[PDB]
Design a protein around this ligand. Sequence first.
Ligand SMILES: Cc1cccc(CCC[C@H](CC(=O)N(C)O)CP(=O)(O)O)c1
Ligand SMILES: Cc1cccc(CCC[C@H](CC(=O)N(C)O)CP(=O)(O)O)c1
Ligand SMILES: [Mn+2]
Ligand SMILES: [Mn+2]
Lengths: 410, 410
Amino acid sequence: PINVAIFGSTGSIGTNALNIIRECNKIENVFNVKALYVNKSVNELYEQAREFLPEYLCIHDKSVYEELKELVKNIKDYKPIILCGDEGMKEICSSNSIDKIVIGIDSFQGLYSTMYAIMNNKIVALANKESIVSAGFFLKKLLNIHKNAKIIPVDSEHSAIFQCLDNNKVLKTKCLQDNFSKINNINKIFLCSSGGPFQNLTMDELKNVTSENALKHPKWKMGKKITIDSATMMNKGLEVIETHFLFDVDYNDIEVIVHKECIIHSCVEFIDKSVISQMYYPDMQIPILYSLTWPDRIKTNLKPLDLAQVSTLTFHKPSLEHFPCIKLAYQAGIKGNFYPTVLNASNEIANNLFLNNKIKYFDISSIISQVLESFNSQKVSENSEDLMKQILQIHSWAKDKATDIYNKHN
Amino acid sequence: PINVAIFGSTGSIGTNALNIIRECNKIENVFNVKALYVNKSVNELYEQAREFLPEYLCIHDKSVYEELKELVKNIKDYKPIILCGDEGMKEICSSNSIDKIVIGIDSFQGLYSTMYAIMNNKIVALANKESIVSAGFFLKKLLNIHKNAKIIPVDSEHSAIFQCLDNNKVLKTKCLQDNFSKINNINKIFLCSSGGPFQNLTMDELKNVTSENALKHPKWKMGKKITIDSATMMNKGLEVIETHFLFDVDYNDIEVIVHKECIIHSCVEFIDKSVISQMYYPDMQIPILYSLTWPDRIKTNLKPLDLAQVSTLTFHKPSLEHFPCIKLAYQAGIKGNFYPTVLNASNEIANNLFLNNKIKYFDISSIISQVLESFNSQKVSENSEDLMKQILQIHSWAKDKATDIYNKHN
Ligand SMILES: Cc1cccc(CCC[C@H](CC(=O)N(C)O)CP(=O)(O)O)c1
Ligand SMILES: Cc1cccc(CCC[C@H](CC(=O)N(C)O)CP(=O)(O)O)c1
Ligand SMILES: [Mn+2]
Ligand SMILES: [Mn+2]
């Protein structure tokens, strides 16, 4: 029986996690959902609690804590531990009845809960790429201290890469460990991208695109921030850095490829030049499920891939002139130090300004570029707590720098 | 160092094996070629012996044994154990200084050497698909007895499938064993086919295709028999049965799919519905190398797959009306017993009659069908020696039956 906690159970990752857990448990009783954690969606948490009956419930927003305790009295034969805030999150992480933790929270509570999961030697199914990009060094350090903790990637491309690896080798190392690529015989990574909604626009059309155009008739259901990142290809830029940290693959050995059908999720070239790829319909249930079952697989009732119906798969190189965010991401990664923290932070501001119609498409990369040019590399702290504080300082600095640049050329 | 014997070292598989061994050894000394075995190409064997300096040389033709003695005196600092015939093959198989044997021989002699390799608990890199189709029961029995012996597939599609599997699972079992698919969480196999030269042809056009049309195929270096089998899709038919035996996958769970670009070499759908595929340019060196390095991979200097240049991959269902050999292969496989032996034997005759312009395209399938219809299921011998004789008897009967059908019609 696999004992799981879901952090951010009402968000996109959380609800997909619970859906695939539900459907797999109908086939064979594999998962016990031991804990659910949400920010403030007390009614939805209640509905999930009624179905999954977790031992722990945690709500971040203290103002709905009493409402949750009263709602839960409706449920028959059920006495959960009901917790609140950061403190409740920490208690869940330290429970011996939880093996695996799904992190479905964005950058703030996300890195925070990831750190506590690692400190408690849990298996951590991590969807939050911003955390790896911004705090990669710190996560590596922490995993070197907490030797039984493991990060398993949930991001579709990174799960794909992970699924292409031989577990006989993966089991002798772990993600974010030095020499991971050597041990797994990895030579090169093809990181597949949908290309986003602006992939076929001319330069002249790109100058005038708005966030409405990016968010209009979205071929897949996702949040506004990641949709904007897909539009600029900064999503794939962040994913390049994520790939480098997760798998210890050199930046010269990570190739972004536009694959508009979104069937091949990424490919790995091994040192013999054989390439292995993972394929499925665009559906987050597979990456989530694999993070929870690894190194095994279990039966699902998901629709089988019909390759003849799919019929055609295409691949092309993205234009760095049309998508300068990719270039900026490689440059920041290659420069190393805290440049990735700065890249992620300045993008967070630039993304939000474009979303809210304050700046144009090419202003996004301009702002990020200027913040990166502005940054001065710092001595990397040896102490893990000092390092965390350093990352937080740089993140805050970079957000304020981007905002100041916006306010200058207002 | 990996100690490898090459059986049939001057044939296509054998020379490709020595090429990749040569190239990999320039990067790092990984392989010691300990034995070479050929039928009668004593000059080519001398040239290979001059480069690889194997401890054993063997020549099946007793007559040219004396000519090999005198040629090998020309090589300096080199006193090899020169053996001959089946007695020499067996002494090579019984050597404790040989780990792996590449079997690139066709017909009975390929099966006979395989048997002796298995009897000495060797790793057998097996390229002869006809031997698995015809003698699968016999090989399975032999592998159950000889617990440390293993067959590792060299056929490109079967190597691809094998490469897609998790070696943490593969190492708990081995090919041609009951429950292999269960242990490896395999749900379904996509068996990729080039489709051969006739995919767009109408039924009326297929009626009059000749072997010259099948063999006017300046694309990949392969022999006449397999080129004819590619044209009829009986090659894929035989590979379906091979798949069933190697990996214990049900016939209803093997799908032939036409992939004309020959980049994806086959795909495995696991029980979660995630699909893993292996990809490379059409090149037999990767499948051969993997059979010799499994469960590890080593560095090569092969050209890296350029996916953006490839650009497009296509897939479609083959038409069973146009390629009835595929339907017959499934039918023979599903019926079980010695029907695959009969299928293989009758195809051997029909293929050769078409190759020599004695029959037409649809006569191939017609002849095979009638032989299959004439065959009465036989009780499968429990004794290992009776079973080998049973297989040989049925093989012979089926070839005669096919020939008699041709002679009545002619
Ligand atoms: C839900 C789903 C699952 C697999 C693939 C897709 C297509 C969108 C892929 C990207 C979103 C993402 O980063 N995922 C899903 O990890 C969009 P992008 O490739 O950056 O244009 C969507
Ligand atoms: C040399 C090479 C290597 C990989 C793929 C190919 C394309 C021909 C594939 C088939 C030949 C074969 O059975 N192999 C190679 O195992 C021809 P087919 O798919 O039956 O039409 C050729
Ligand atoms: Mn992604
Ligand atoms: Mn083949």
